Amino acid sequence: VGWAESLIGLHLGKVALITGGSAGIGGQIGRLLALSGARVMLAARDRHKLEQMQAMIQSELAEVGYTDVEDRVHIAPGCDVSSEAQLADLVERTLSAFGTVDYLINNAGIAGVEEMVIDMPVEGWRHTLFANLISNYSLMRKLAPLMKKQGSGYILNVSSYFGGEKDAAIPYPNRADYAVSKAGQRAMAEVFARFLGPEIQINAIAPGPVEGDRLRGTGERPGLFARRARLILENKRLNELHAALIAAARTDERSMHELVELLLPNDVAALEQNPAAPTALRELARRFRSEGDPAASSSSALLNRSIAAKLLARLHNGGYVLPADIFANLPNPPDPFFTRAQIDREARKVRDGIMGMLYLQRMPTEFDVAMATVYYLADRNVSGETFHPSGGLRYERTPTGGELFGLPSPERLAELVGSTVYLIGEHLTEHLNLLARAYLERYGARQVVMIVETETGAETMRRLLHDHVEAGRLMTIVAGDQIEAAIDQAITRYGRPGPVVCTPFRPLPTVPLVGRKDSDWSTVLSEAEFAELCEHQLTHHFRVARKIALSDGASLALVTPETTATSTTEQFALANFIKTTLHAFTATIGVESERTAQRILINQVDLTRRARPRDPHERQQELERFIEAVLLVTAPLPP
Amino acid sequence: VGWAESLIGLHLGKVALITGGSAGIGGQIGRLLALSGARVMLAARDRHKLEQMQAMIQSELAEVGYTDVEDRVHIAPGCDVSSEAQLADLVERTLSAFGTVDYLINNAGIAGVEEMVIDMPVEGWRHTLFANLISNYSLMRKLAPLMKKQGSGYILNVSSYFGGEKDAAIPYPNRADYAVSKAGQRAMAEVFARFLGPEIQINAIAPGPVEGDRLRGTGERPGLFARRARLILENKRLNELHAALIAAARTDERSMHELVELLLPNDVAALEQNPAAPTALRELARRFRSEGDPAASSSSALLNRSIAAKLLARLHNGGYVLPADIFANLPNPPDPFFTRAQIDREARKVRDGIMGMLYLQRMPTEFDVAMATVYYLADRNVSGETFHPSGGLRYERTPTGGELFGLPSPERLAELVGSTVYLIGEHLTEHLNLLARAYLERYGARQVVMIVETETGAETMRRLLHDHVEAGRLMTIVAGDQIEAAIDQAITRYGRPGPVVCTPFRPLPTVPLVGRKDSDWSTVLSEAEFAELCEHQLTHHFRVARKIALSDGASLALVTPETTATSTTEQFALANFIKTTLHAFTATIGVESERTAQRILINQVDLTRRARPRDPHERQQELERFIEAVLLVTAPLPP
Ligand SMILES: NC(=O)c1ccc[n+]([C@@H]2O[C@H](COP(=O)([O-])OP(=O)(O)OC[C@H]3O[C@@H](n4cnc5c(N)ncnc54)[C@H](OP(=O)(O)O)[C@@H]3O)[C@@H](O)[C@H]2O)c1
Ligand SMILES: NC(=O)c1ccc[n+]([C@@H]2O[C@H](COP(=O)([O-])OP(=O)(O)OC[C@H]3O[C@@H](n4cnc5c(N)ncnc54)[C@H](OP(=O)(O)O)[C@@H]3O)[C@@H](O)[C@H]2O)c1
């Protein structure tokens, strides 16, 4: 009896659905579940790879002695998990093949946009959330009614170390969309376990780095390490150019338009020697020539067309005026822009740092991780947890949820005199009133710009703040679903902000999170409502942070939802879900912002104490602690 | 092929040592490791139970088809893990039987003292640390040199949910010694993994509540639930008596001596009707008669001899003067003091609450936990982690390591005027100087009592604080290893404290935590040095907290070790070990203190930011943040 005999019978009688099941970790989970007696459905996009994994597993089952192997491994091609229609067709296909699903393995996880937040299109961020997070809720919502009806089920989200930990965030620079989606997979397990129990287990796994094609690549496409290496070099050029232009603009009278025109020759030596160029650009050109590889055209040309478009988008998004065609006639540098020597050097440094982080100084294989996971899936007695099948890393984490604090120093508070404050929100009218009055009346801010969602919320705040509106100290802008343009309007008409307090427009929903055993679940939080929760409680803050991180001098506070004595226990859960998931965003953009030209601070203030009222005195002291917390992170630090 | 065939070969070639291996979870781990091919040594105290487990396992191995089963299961009787001499004999016995140990399963875990901190003898606390925590380091220190020499090994500490989580404490009222030992088992794994890798894995497991004799009991001895139930009733009587006497003393001119004499008739109805008794004691007697079971003598008698001795010890330890024989002639109430109906009612409430905490509303068996653990032990790719083989609980956790804070309000600071401050410490002379001067010069405290360890430390602080010593504002007491008597001296001579800041006497050691592969490890932190670390960095704070929790009006800050730019990476690790382990103490005594008559606040201030210097300005701002942090938790809250 060989190694697969430790598996025989382990999951006999189980039906498992594995997304991303045609390769990688999910391929090996589907393989090993099938060897252990489960009937499996493998879902992914490319038909050919699914058929090759299906034939490999079926062949292996027969070697072990199973009969009718065609009934034990099924495939669902064309299934992009980011498409809800496909997820509905997946469930229909799986139930018709096998009946009720016991194990939902939410394994598919796209790498995402792989850009800094400030270069990350809003739609790409949405696509990552749909593929990696919203799909996990969508499949659970479709399969959990059947699991609960039969009395048993298991939902397993494949998260990551870069989704953080129960009480600590871990930044993942250039991967904020991925990190947030990973963190949300874990938070789903932590907050939904109490509702899904006793019948249904829900846990996450969070592997450390895994040896396979995703990290290492193949003979055709570069893996995560090589892509990260080239991006290190690309973004080094973009960040250095962007930073130098911002600095040069600080002490040159020419416009950003005219400074960018100095780059049009795209000639490194000609810019170093151009006596009419500001010295920040000439020292940059000297730097490119000194540190660069003489065989790379990046060492003799400033830009390529792709980096030029990223630069222009940053300048446009940070309020500068330049024609869209400014880079149309830019000479194209001859290939290669960075050589293989540069890229491979950076790739080896990426892998060597990661191996140095691991306590064990070795990565598991995809087979190793799947094996640990398939043993873990036999444990009937744990729910709400994150299992680490590999790992142990020296990465720096940021503890979340510190409870005690006071006011900032008198020195930092005096710097608020004369400042411009942006407040963003709609639902939390009492917080918004109190904050505006604290900035204007207590700390001598010049003005507050109150950015709301609707005209009705505008009128609510104008009424609450009627005296400051009349004195011209409180301005209201109606953002709708165009918050970027509203921030542009504030900047143009009232000036750049110091403090920016970003509260959600919308409250949390008040619907059930699970259905009664014999119900149709029709009142339970729907798939589209979960996408809406993400839009209003995550994407909202991301969009504001994306713009405000280009606004020099701003200090940004991201405020997560409130829960009161009125709030249902489902609202408490969803607030804790959002807290944990957003902390992954906040920690990540914090690290990226240190590398940006712009001095901007980004912090998170949580209104829900995760504790779950006694007289309006305790109410007014809970709100006063909120004011203190916001001031603690929006008062500037005197240089 | 049956269920044990999923185990055949899983740990073939491994030698495992399981402490507490004759029953419970450790018995099942030893059983299941032996079925999976490992040779096992089972260690525990009682010879008979070890022989019965050995014969059961050997018999089962033979049923499965192993030969020479006598070579596969060995026992080590007489091994109390709290005795270092026994641990040395255990290792010698195991190496001679099997050669090198691959798996150290630190499973033995005594329940401990099972009292509130204020009723917990210092020696019992020490015994729990020796049995449950110091023994884990001791066996690792003896076995890790051989594991590292052969290139592989595994250390598994059996911790608990009530050891908390990486970044959050979980209180365990009446079990502070056990909770601290559990938390230290986890912290050992988290901080030692980077040093023990790549050759040696070290993780913890933390089961939730487990179905077996430990929780449920047997037909002879009561299990954890029944003991907890009786203790609920006993301690309810003790706490209520203690509280009423303290209150009665607040408004009666008689001494505590004379008030306690009112209890000597031990007659509930006679005290309710005694017109000479203070009303707090008469309302207590009325309460005992109203809520009590008429069949329990607790409803007609005030005390028994055991509760009387606990009461007297609390009064003596809180500074009151009473003769040791005051309860010598106390009439003994006839059995039963609490009936079976009362105790069983409380036991059912204990079990029902626990089952309601579990998301899954069911406990694993000892077999289930061992099975999950034995699968986990095959995972070669994770170190430094805590695996939860069962669990998912609704318990409230306290996040640790919040980073941002300011000063407390002006209102709380003004209440420091005229206060008496106790500072405890020796090594941290700069912190102690700065704190004393902040209390005396900035906030108008009446006086500081500086409690040091040695005459040399006394003279150091007298020199640093020479002006305040001359003005009579700074008093020094030399505690030696008698910190309780030193606190008694402060109280008698200078008055009760408001703020009490407890810093460690000793710095952290500067020795290696692991040895080079071919070394003898003789310079590595020794077994006795690890016990010393616990004495100086845990037991120190516990002893102070034990006394100060009886001092009305005190606010206690427990300060964990400092790490600077000088500090080695081993010191950084040991500081993080102590931080995590002490937070379990701080969170637990905080909950017990809410139930004590005495209004005392207990908080923890961590000097090591777990981050790992730029000019004395950053130094003076790091120390100023320490001052702010200490003030934030020692300034009283105005009523
Ligand atoms: N690799 C690591 O080091 C690591 C570490 C921690 C966590 N994880 C997590 O582990 C999970 C699996 O990772 P992996 O390394 O196995 O990734 P991978 O190798 O890139 O996954 C490949 C599989 O995912 C499928 N897939 C890709 N995009 C998809 C989409 N939009 N819809 C449906 N299926 C899709 C692929 O098939 P098609 O392309 O044909 O659709 C293929 O079946 C992920 O959730 C990842 O976040 C990985
Ligand atoms: N039970 C739970 O719900 C639970 C939950 C979480 C964690 N845990 C942890 O799991 C571990 C095992 O727990 P358990 O429920 O199996 O405990 P248990 O049933 O009380 O353990 C009994 C075993 O421990 C031995 N033992 C007791 N005191 C000892 C000492 N001073 N030295 C050496 N051996 C000793 C006993 O033999 P002798 O009496 O003959 O020495 C017997 O072999 C413990 O570390 C515990 O903290 C338990």
Q: How far apart are CA A538 and CA A56, in angstroms?
A: 41
SS3 B501: strand
Do A436 and A423 contact (CB within 8 A), yes or no? yes
Contact A379 B390 (CB under 8 A): yes
- Helix or strand holding residue A398 (H, E): strand A398-399
Ligand nearest to the CA of B112: 2
Interface test with B, best of A32, A379, A390, A398 (most B CBs within 10 A): A379
Q: Which of A375, A376, A404 sits opposite B632 (nearest CB)?
A: A404
Angle (deg, nearest 10), helices A176-196 and A569-595:
160
State if residue A108 touches ligand 1 by the CB under 6 angstroms criterion: yes
Residues 6+ apart with CB under 8 A from A125: A113, A176, A177, A539, A542
SS (H, E, C) A326-345: CCCCCCCCCCCCCCHHHHHH
Amino acid at A485: A
Q: How far apart are CA B172 and CA B184, in angstroms?
A: 14
User: Which among B163, B405, B594, B396 has a CA at the least distance from the CA of A610?
Assistant: B396
Q: What's the distance, Cα to Cα, between the start and end of chain A in Å?
A: 71
Annotated binding residue at A439? no
CA distances B87 to B16, B130, B170, Å, are: 15, 11, 30
Contact B197 A392 (CB under 8 A): yes
Amino acid at B475: M
Q: Beta partners for B601?
A: B555
C-alpha triplet A110, B392, A533: angle, nearest 5°: 45
Sequence-ordered strand ranges (E) for A77-186: 103-106, 153-158, 168-169
* Torsions phi, psi for A493 (to 5 deg): -85, -30
Backbone discontinuities in chain B, residue before each (C to N > 2.5 A): 612
SS3 A529: helix
> In this structure, how many other beta carbons lie within 10 angstroms of the beta carbon of residue B188?
24
- How many H-runs (helices) and E-runs (strands) does chain B carry? 23, 15
Contact B368 A359 (CB under 8 A): no
**Distance from Cα B165 to the centre of ligand 2, integer Å:** 21
Q: How far apart are CA B377 and CA B371, in angstroms?
A: 10
Asked if residue B499 has a cis previous peptide bond (ω within 30° of 0), the answer is: no
User: Which among A173, A169, A118, A122 has a CA at the least distance from the CA of A584?
Assistant: A169
State if residue B209 touches ligand 2 by the CB under 6 angstroms criterion: yes
Interface test with B, best of A359, A395, A569 (most B CBs within 10 A): A359
Give A399's contacts in chain B (Cβ within 8 Å). Answer: 167, 399-403
**Tokens 């507050």 label which residue?**
A448
Do A191 and A573 contact (CB within 8 A), yes or no? yes
Annotated binding residue at A20? yes
Residues 6+ apart with CB under 8 A from B355: B361, B362, B363
Q: Which of A214, A215, A225 to mutate to test the pocket of ligand 1 (most atoms within 8 A of CB)?
A: A214
Q: What's the distance, Cα to Cα, between the start and end of chain B in Å?
A: 71
Q: How far apart are CA A105 and CA A139, in angstroms?
A: 10
Asked if residue B198 has a cis previous peptide bond (ω within 30° of 0), the answer is: yes
A168-169 and A398-399 strand pairing: antiparallel
The radius of gyration of chain B from alpha carbons, rounded to an integer in Å, stands at 27
Do A207 and A364 contact (CB within 8 A), yes or no? yes
Contact B392 A383 (CB under 8 A): yes
**Tokens 């990661």 label which residue?**
A354
Nearest CA-CA distance, residue A373 and chain B, Å: 10
Do B243 and B595 contact (CB within 8 A), yes or no? no
> In this structure, how many other beta carbons lie within 10 angstroms of the beta carbon of residue A410?
9
> What's the distance, CA A514 to chain centroid?
26
> What's the distance, CA A125 to chain centroid?
7
Angle (deg, nearest 10), helices B305-317 and B224-250:
50
Ligand nearest to the CA of B204: 2
Q: How far apart are CA A578 and CA A588, in angstroms?
A: 16
Do A199 and A153 contact (CB within 8 A), yes or no? yes
Residues 6+ apart with CB under 8 A from A622: none
Give B408's contacts in chain A (Cβ within 8 Å). Answer: 406
Domain ranges of chain B: 2-224+361-395, 225-360, 396-639
**Distance from Cα A28 to the centre of ligand 1, integer Å:** 11
Q: How far apart are CA A401 and CA A168, in angstroms?
A: 8
SS3 B603: strand
Residues 6+ apart with CB under 8 A from A247: A280, A597
Do B448 and B473 contact (CB within 8 A), yes or no? yes
SS3 A490: helix
Nearest CA-CA distance, residue A485 and chain B, Å: 33
CA distances B108 to A399, A632, B76, Å, are: 32, 47, 13
Interface test with A, best of B64, B373, B381, B412 (most A CBs within 10 A): B381
A202-241 burial, b at 16+ Cβ within 10 Å, e below that, comes to: bbbbbbbbbbbebbebeeeeebbbbbbbbbbbbbebbbeb
State if residue A111 touches ligand 1 by the CB under 6 angstroms criterion: no
Do B17 and B42 contact (CB within 8 A), yes or no? no
SS3 A176: helix
**Distance from Cα B365 to the centre of ligand 2, integer Å:** 14
| Resolution rounded to one decimal, in angstroms | 2.1
Task: Compute the residue count for chain A.
Answer: 639
Contact B632 A168 (CB under 8 A): no
Q: How was this structure determined?
A: X-ray
SS3 A451: strand
Q: Which of B6, B167, B194 sits opposite A165 (nearest CB)?
A: B167
SS3 A502: strand
Closest chain A CA to residue B359? A194
Q: Which of A168, A384, A394 sits opposite B359 (nearest CB)?
A: A384
User: Which among A340, A171, A178, A330 has a CA at the least distance from the CA of A241?
Assistant: A330
Annotated binding residue at A163? no
* Torsions phi, psi for A557 (to 5 deg): -115, 120
**Tokens 């031990």 label which residue?**
B266
Question: Which numbered atom of ligand 1 lies nearest the CA of A42?
Answer: 43
State if residue A291 touches ligand 1 by the CB under 6 angstroms criterion: no
Q: Biggest alpha carbon distance in chain A?
A: 85
Residue nearest to atom 14 of ligand 1 (CA): A24
Task: Describe chain A by its helix, strand, coil percentages, rounded to 5.
Answer: 50, 10, 35
Six token digits for residue A302? 């400033």
Fill in the DSSP letter of residue B500. Answer: E
Q: How far apart are CA B132 and CA B108, in angstroms?
A: 7
Amino acid at B48: H
* Count of CA atoms in the C-beta half-sphere (13 A) of A622: 18
- Helix or strand holding residue B557 (H, E): strand B555-560
Q: How far apart are CA A611 and CA A623, in angstroms?
A: 16
- Helix or strand holding residue B140 (H, E): helix B135-150
Nearest CA-CA distance, residue B5 and chain A, Å: 6
**Distance from Cα B108 to the centre of ligand 2, integer Å:** 5
> In this structure, how many other beta carbons lie within 10 angstroms of the beta carbon of residue A532?
16
Q: How far apart are CA A152 and CA A570, in angstroms?
A: 22
Do A205 and A379 contact (CB within 8 A), yes or no? no
SS (H, E, C) B447-491: EEEEEECCHHHHHHHHHHCHHHHHCCCEEEEECCCCHHHHHHHHH
Annotated binding residue at A117? no
* Torsions phi, psi for B398 (to 5 deg): -115, 105
Handedness of CA A390, A394, A398, A402 (dihedral sign): positive
Question: Which numbered atom of ligand 1 lies nearest the CA of A207?
Answer: 6
Give A378's contacts in chain B (Cβ within 8 Å). Answer: 371-372, 375
Nearest 10 degrees: Cα torsion B380, B383, B385, B390: 20
Contact B402 A397 (CB under 8 A): no
Six token digits for residue A121? 């299109």
Q: Beta partners for A204?
A: A157, A386
SS (H, E, C) A170-235: CCCCCCHHHHHHHHHHHHHHHHHHHHHCCCEEEEEECCCCCECHHHHECCCCECHHHHHHHHHHHH
Q: Is A486 exposed, middle or buried (0-12, 13-18, 19+ CB in 10 A)?
A: buried
Fill in the DSSP letter of residue B522. Answer: T
**Tokens 């994994």 label which residue?**
A53
Do A539 and A134 contact (CB within 8 A), yes or no? no
**Distance from Cα B85 to the centre of ligand 1, integer Å:** 53
Give A376's contacts in chain B (Cβ within 8 Å). Answer: 372, 375
State if residue A498 touches ligand 1 by the CB under 6 angstroms criterion: no
**Tokens 């055709």 label which residue?**
A220
**Tokens 């010393």 label which residue?**
B532
Q: Which of B197, B404, B628 sits opposite A361 (nearest CB)?
A: B197
Do A47 and A78 contact (CB within 8 A), yes or no? yes
Six token digits for residue A220? 């055709």
SS3 A137: helix
Sequence-ordered strand ranges (E) for A44-188: 73-76, 103-106, 153-158, 168-169
Q: How far apart are CA A120 and CA B283, in angstroms?
A: 69
* Torsions phi, psi for A440 (to 5 deg): -80, -45
Amino acid at B278: P
State if residue A51 touches ligand 1 by the CB under 6 angstroms criterion: no
SS3 B295: coil
A166-201 burial, b at 16+ Cβ within 10 Å, e below that, comes to: bbbbbbbbbbbbbbbbbbbbbbbbbbbbbbbbebbb
Q: How far apart are CA B51 and CA B287, in angstroms?
A: 52
Six token digits for residue B284? 């207590």
Six token digits for residue B610? 């777990």
* Count of CA atoms in the C-beta half-sphere (13 A) of A598: 24
Ligand nearest to the CA of A106: 1
- Helix or strand holding residue B229 (H, E): helix B224-250
Nearest CA-CA distance, residue A72 and chain B, Å: 21
Q: How far apart are CA B478 and CA B450, in angstroms?
A: 9
Closest chain A CA to residue B407? A406
State if residue B42 touches ligand 2 by the CB under 6 angstroms criterion: no
Handedness of CA B255, B257, B258, B260 (dihedral sign): positive
Do A549 and A596 contact (CB within 8 A), yes or no? yes
Six token digits for residue A456? 């009705």
Closest chain A CA to residue B196? A359
C-alpha triplet A366, A367, A371: angle, nearest 5°: 120
Q: How far apart are CA A445 and CA B291, in angstroms?
A: 60
- Helix or strand holding residue B148 (H, E): helix B135-150
Question: Which numbered atom of ligand 2 lies nearest the CA of B185?
Answer: 45
DSSP string, B408-450: --HHHHHTTTT-EEEEE-SS-HHHHHHHHHIIIIIT--SEEEE
Q: How far apart are CA A544 and CA A554, in angstroms?
A: 12
Q: How far apart are CA A402 and CA A610, in angstroms?
A: 12
Amino acid at B234: E
Six token digits for residue B157? 């500490």
Task: Compute the residue count for chain B.
Answer: 639
